[PDB]
Design a protein around this ligand. Structure first.
Ligand SMILES: [Zn+2]
Lengths: 349, 165, 371, 164, 266
């Protein structure tokens, strides 16, 4: 059972599949990817020029059957667009500014199923794995945010089960999902029902050429799917909003229990400030704590000097860095804290 | 949040001498007046050893000093925005309400290190109307995650819900 | 060639700039709320300063007929001047036209000369009037700030077509953001009655708003566009640059200064000579907190020095070295106690800084160019 | 294509001519309205569009028809409302004008029900701006204080007002 | 093969791109409203730069547009956080005293500060076929565009706000299928006291790159990328099994590394 259909994921921050009714400086768009637009995307991915497209490639690929499922409808967003500001414009020339207003779709995603010849689908997918040219979503200022070559080809019978095959991928966990997903699919005669129903509407996106752009109409129908029954909700990948590493804390750990022994050996079991016999070790340079402990930034200390340094660190600021003995600074405050500890701390506690 | 409960219970268990010691240290650091440092270390250190969670040191210090100055019976269901809204509703709606509301809304702009006096004026307004309770556990939990946006959102929403009724 | 000045200035509690509701102006930078002083406020306070008085040769006014009458003496021509001003597409709403007009003060005598004589007709004189306002650009303040003026079209004389009446700005001034978080404060004031009565009440009760902050000021001057704005007057351009430095350093905006008097000097000035403008406002994307071991100004200067080192090491180009001077009074505040290498010259006197800037600019001396 | 002082861009001008055409012998109860629309200013073509509208009948009054026929100036009053004390020489809130076309297009799916007033109404259509205005308020009043939440609450209430 | 440049740039409060009403241009993403800079504004500001023109069939016609189809591709500059527009209330002053303290003019202007994410794409095959087999000039114009795009900004309202900032993170990658990383900032960046706006944006970019490297990009073909911050100001994924192949602390070194990969030219 060789695969017979190809799936396209069309999702980007900004999208614009232009409609037939623009014809002027009001560049509009359609609610779904047009057939001519995705055909031009395919021809750009295969490296076929505009003149070369009109002879064989477009008539060959116009025999496929296409259906688009809506994953996210998006929001239509306009854009004021001036041309030739501070510069002349063609036709002789004129020092003038051209005003226009463009329309894009924002935060939208579509799934396109294109059933056809298995060799055609295989060659098309092979071309789409490494596109010849940069493929955008309608306009050149709309690059895709997801790989078009994402979903694998397969063999199915109807377009409804084809759009049922691919699960719906969820964003962040709180985000809700659409409950009724509209599918817009090409009308199929079947050679028995020769006359289309009255709900079938004409769209004008059957292409012939691209340099003298020519289109013909086609009958398009619109049905719907129910999520869960027809499309299973996929689960998001392992991800999170980036947070700075809050490190960890663990002394029971045997590796630190031996690093402190190495430190007490290497400073010869003596304090750095008052040179009394050492009791513990202060953990200066708290970065790389727990798993990447280097017995260099640690400094052995007695109980009174360690308590004084902890008193100084609890007061004032406190960040990943610490207060390091052997510094010529902070000596006077450490000695004052030593005096206060000696003359004020009560052992009855 | 059991560590916060133990912290608040130990705060209520305090005698009057160390309460006066903490009262004398309002607005101060942690590096001076050694009895305060020793008392705070005795209060806070056993929480980390048994309980994996523990309130932040600055939050715990602020809560201890505020409890020393403004001794309130800890009671569940007496969060600060709700009491503030109940006080604000029984006010003149033209002059006093904007002033007191501005003093309340000043709070949700700073960090933990500068909330002492803007909280002390709030506790003074509370003590003016003879309150007898305050949710120290909920206030500590909210103050811990003060940088999360839904925390401030729920703080303001609870204040508005108590104000409106 | 561009001269860029970055300044750090801590201010006493005051309200130097405020919006329509009286609150001090704020902005959102780096996701955090900072205090702001609008750039036009700084530009006007420098422009209308005492230290810039010898260079003020332009007026931005709405009442030009009043100036015409006040410079014509006693002969009555005020209605006539208003009429000719209306003919060149300016409109008239009770002695003040609908638009502000920027023009050097030296050309009011010429306008008086055209308006006085009845030898010429009306409409042609209007055209002549345009030719004086389109060429009254030889002022230091017009050269610095820049002027654009577009007159009306529904009441023009159809024979008064205008020349080019714009001047590109030779000075870019940023909005003075704060290096730390915003801390707005309310001052509850009362105003008492000097005459006793029955009650103990006072005349008025209100609240004002004030805040104290450390501001980061950024200015940029384009020397080539400056000397083109004054038509090759390099001497006058250098005089403007020196006077502008003195006024910017030694002047503060006069907003509520009779009640706060925050006349604070800058604690650090960095003057760089470049070819492309760079702003060090991203030094304080992380707001400056306070540690007991230092203070606000020293921490701000250290953060600025760290970001300047980052910028110089990450955008070094051997084709365009950058020469900068650091100024602090009597070298009170160096450029951080970590590098001692980002400042090509350390200056402790403001006058020496201005003289060195002028000598780098063109080799002139200050006392030569002051007149 | 400019959205000047007296006009706010909202696209799809179908709402304008359904008063004069639906008042003098242009009614056949059931049918589909084809509604070719070509717009130009002096010797300059601007735009051309079309829209079919399904109708069944259900003759209605003229007050709602006149209000719907004047929807162009109802939206312009919504956008041009600021929060300060300047006079009419102002632009109001420009961020509303960015979300106006999407809400207008989403309402326009039920033009037949809007015109016949059998399942749609002006107050029925005001809910479409309610979800869009929630996201704009988070940007115009971004603080987390009580007052900012209050201004955000008052901002969602901005619904268009029919007036002729 | 395709070259892709991703850029993170915070801007001081300004109005770098306007519309018919003066407001900064915005867009919609992640369920919220973000600030935006239109792609044609960035392309124009890159193209007409005097330092760019004085630096380098024509190289600008080969890279940009005028069937001559450009290999350049500039996407709209979305923002990694919720937009925050603001109004500044300006009052004009009169130097001539009158009967009252009138202004002369009263109004409001708009400004906004944002941390924009920029995406760029250069098609190497179209570039080399545009210049008829030439390669050294192609690498030269690629480097020229890299320096220009790293050191340029739009001129909108820069006489009043002066937002002459510099980028704080650049990521240059080589791969075949074009994918942008705007999906990283689907969740808007919210600041915390332990990080910056730029730091969190760079970290979220690193997280998204790590997740997509663990996913679609299998061992079919390795992906070569270079990460640059000034003087190693910000790391993209500290260690993290070397998510970025290199860490660079000067623009010239990144330009040389990219040139030496693409052709080995210097
Ligand atoms: Zn010791």
């Amino acid at each position: 059972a060789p695969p017979n259909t190809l799936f396209l994921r069309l999702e980007g921050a900004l999208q614009s599949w232009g409609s037939n009714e623009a014809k002027f400086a009001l560049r509009r768009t359609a609610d779904a990817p047009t057939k001519s637009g995705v055909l031009g995307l395919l021809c750009a991915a295969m490296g076929i020029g505009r003149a070369e497209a009109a002879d064989s490639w477009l008539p060959k690929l116009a025999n496929l059957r296409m259906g688009v499922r809506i994953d996210r409808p998006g929001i239509r967003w306009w854009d004021f667009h001036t041309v030739g500001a501070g510069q002349r414009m063609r036709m002789k020339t004129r020092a003038e500014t051209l005003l226009s207003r463009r329309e894009y779709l924002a935060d939208a995603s579509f799934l396109v199923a294109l059933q056809g010849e298995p060799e055609l689908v295989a060659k098309l997918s092979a071309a789409l794995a490494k596109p010849v040219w940069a493929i955008y979503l309608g306009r050149k200022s709309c690059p895709p945010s997801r790989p078009v070559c994402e979903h694998p080809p397969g063999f199915y019978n109807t377009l409804e089960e084809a759009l049922s095959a691919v699960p719906l991928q969820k964003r962040w966990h709180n985000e809700p999902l659409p409950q009724i997903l509209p599918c817009v699919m090409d009308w199929i005669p079947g050679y028995d029902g020769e006359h289309a129903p009255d709900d079938a509407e004409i769209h004008y996106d059957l292409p012939v050429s691209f340099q003298p752009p020519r289109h013909l109409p086609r009958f398009v129908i619109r049905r719907e799917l129910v999520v869960g029954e027809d499309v299973q909700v996929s689960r998001e990948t392992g991800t999170s909003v980036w947070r700075p590493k809050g490190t960890r804390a663990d002394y029971n750990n045997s590796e630190y229990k031996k690093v402190r022994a190495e430190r007490l050996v290497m400073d010869h079991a003596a304090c750095m400030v008052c040179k009394a016999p050492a009791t513990t070790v202060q953990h200066v340079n708290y970065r790389r704590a727990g798993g990447k402990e280097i017995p260099e930034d640690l400094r052995a200390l007695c109980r009174l000097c360690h308590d004084a340094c902890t008193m100084l660190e609890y007061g004032s600021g406190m960040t990943t860095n610490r207060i390091d003995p052997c510094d010529p600074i902070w000596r006077e405050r450490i000695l004052a804290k030593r005096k206060e500890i000696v003359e004020f701390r009560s052992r009855g506690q | 949040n059991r560590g916060t409960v133990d912290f608040i219970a130990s705060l209520e268990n305090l005698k009057e001498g160390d309460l006066g010691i903490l009262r004398k240290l309002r607005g101060a650091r942690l590096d001076e007046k050694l009895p305060g440092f020793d008392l705070f270390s005795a209060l806070w250190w056993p929480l980390r050893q048994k309980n994996q969670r523990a309130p932040k040191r600055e939050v715990a210090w602020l809560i201890a000093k505020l409890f020393a100055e403004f001794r309130f019976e800890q009671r569940e269901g007496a969060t600060l925005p709700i009491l503030m809204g109940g006080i604000c509703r029984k006010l003149e709606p033209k002059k006093e309400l904007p002033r007191v509301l501005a003093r309340f809304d000043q709070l949700a702009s700073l960090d933990i290190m500068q909330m002492e006096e803007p909280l002390s004026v709030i506790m003074g307004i509370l003590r003016k109307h003879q309150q007898v309770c305050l949710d120290w556990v909920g206030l500590t939990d909210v103050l811990s995650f003060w940088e999360q946006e839904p925390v401030k959102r729920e703080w303001s929403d609870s204040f508005i819900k108590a104000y409106k009724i | 060639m561009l001269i860029e000045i970055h300044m750090i200035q801590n201010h006493s509690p005051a309200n130097l700039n405020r919006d329509d509701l009286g609150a001090p102006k704020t902005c959102y930078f780096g996701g955090v709320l900072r205090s702001r002083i609008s750039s036009q406020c700084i530009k006007r306070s420098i422009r209308t300063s005492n230290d810039f008085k010898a260079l003020l040769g332009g007026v931005r006014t709405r009442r030009l007929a009043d100036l015409i009458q006040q410079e014509a003496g006693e002969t009555e021509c005020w209605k006539k001047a208003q009429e000719i001003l209306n003919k060149c597409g300016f409109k008239n709403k009770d002695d003040n036209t609908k638009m502000l007009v920027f023009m050097s003060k030296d050309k009011i005598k010429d306008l008086a000369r055209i308006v006085l004589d009845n030898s010429l007709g009306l409409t042609e004189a209007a055209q002549q009037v345009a030719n004086v306002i389109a060429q009254a650009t030889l002022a230091p303040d017009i050269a610095l700030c820049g002027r654009m003026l577009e007159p009306n079209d529904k009441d023009k004389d159809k024979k008064v077509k205008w020349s080019n009446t714009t001047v590109e700005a030779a000075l870019q001034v940023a909005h003075a953001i704060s290096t730390h978080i915003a801390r707005p404060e309310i001052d509850y004031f009362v105003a008492a009655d000097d005459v006793p009565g029955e009650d103990a009440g006072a005349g008025h009760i209100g609240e004002s708003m004030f805040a104290s902050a450390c501001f980061y000021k950024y200015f940029s001057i384009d020397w080539e566009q400056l000397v083109k704005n004054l038509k090759g007057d390099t001497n006058l351009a250098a005089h403007t640059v020196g006077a502008f430095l003195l006024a910017a350093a030694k002047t503060n905006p006069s907003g509520k200064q009779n009640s706060f008097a925050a006349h604070n000097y800058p604690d650090g000035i960095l003057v760089e000579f470049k070819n492309s403008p760079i702003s060090y406002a991203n030094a304080f994307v992380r707001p400056v907190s306070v540690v007991k071991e230092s203070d606000l100004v020293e921490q701000s200067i250290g953060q600025l020095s760290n970001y300047v080192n980052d910028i110089r090491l990450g955008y070094y180009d051997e084709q365009s070295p950058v020469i900068g001077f650091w100024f602090s009074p009597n070298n009170r505040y160096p450029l951080g106690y970590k590098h001692s290498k980002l400042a090509s010259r350390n200056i402790g006197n403001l006058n020496e800084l201005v003289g060195a800037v002028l000598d780098y600019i063109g080799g002139f001396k200050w006392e030569e160019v002051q007149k | 294509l400019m959205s000047n002082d007296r006009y706010t861009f909202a696209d799809r001008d179908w709402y304008s001519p359904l008063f004069s055409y639906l008042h003098a012998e242009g009614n056949s109860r059931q049918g589909k309205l084809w509604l070719v629309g070509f717009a130009s200013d002096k010797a300059k073509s601007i735009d051309i569009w079309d829209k079919i509208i399904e109708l069944e009948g259900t003759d209605t009054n003229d007050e709602l028809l006149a209000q719907l026929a004047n929807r162009a100036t109802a939206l312009n009053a919504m956008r041009k409302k600021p929060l300060r004390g300047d006079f009419k020489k102002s632009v109001g809130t420009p961020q509303i004008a960015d979300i106006i076309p999407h809400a207008e297009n989403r309402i326009a799916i039920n033009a037949g029900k809007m015109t016949e007033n059998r399942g749609y109404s002006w107050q029925d259509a005001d809910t479409e701006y309610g979800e869009l205005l929630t996201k704009v308020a988070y940007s115009l009043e971004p603080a987390q204080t009580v007052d900012a939440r209050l201004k955000r609450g008052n901002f969602i209430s901005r619904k268009p007002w029919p007036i002729i």
